[PDB]
Structure 1
């Protein structure tokens, strides 16, 4: 399925994903497409930050859902 990943700064990324993909898996897909290190990525759905170990289906993320992406620096 397709999902959309939107920055707060105007950029939309389209990803090919499965319901069973972890957030870790999704961040790796973003790195593949955009070059953004997974340690620097924070993914957002339903106004909350998503955790690495959970699946898309765990958050009820479906076909044509929009996630948001923000950057974290620190030690990432």
Structure 2
């Protein structure tokens, strides 16, 4: 509606392969649920299994980027659940 920057950039670093890098713009107030929603739009990995991690912190449900005190174009580490057993 008017001039103003709300959304904030981000950096996706695949844990399995550092070569896989993807910069995505998402609001800080955006919760990991919506943020990861985009992460799926680019990677395709189901959210329920997508384990993202901020600066030493783990991405929880309902938690917003701002909750982690992130910054414009903050670093994010992408991960995925494993079998183990």
TM-score, normalised with respect to structure 2: 0.78
SS at match of 1:26: helix
1:2 counterpart (2, 9, 30)? 9
Unaligned runs of 5+ in 1: none
Higher radius of gyration, 1 or 2: 2
- Does the 8 Å CA contact 2:57/2:68 hold for their aligned counterparts? no
Match of 1:57 in 2: 66
Considering only aligned residues, what root-mean-square deviation do their CA atoms show, in Å? 1.3
More strand by share: 1
Match of 1:45 in 2: 54
Aligned length: 74
Give the distance between the partners of 1:60 and 1:23, measured in 2 at CA.
13
TM-score, normalised with respect to structure 1: 0.86
Structure with more relative contact order (C-alpha pairs < 8 Å, separation 6 or more): 1
Unaligned runs of 5+ in 2: 1-7
Which 4+ stretches in 1 moved above 3 angstroms? Answer: none
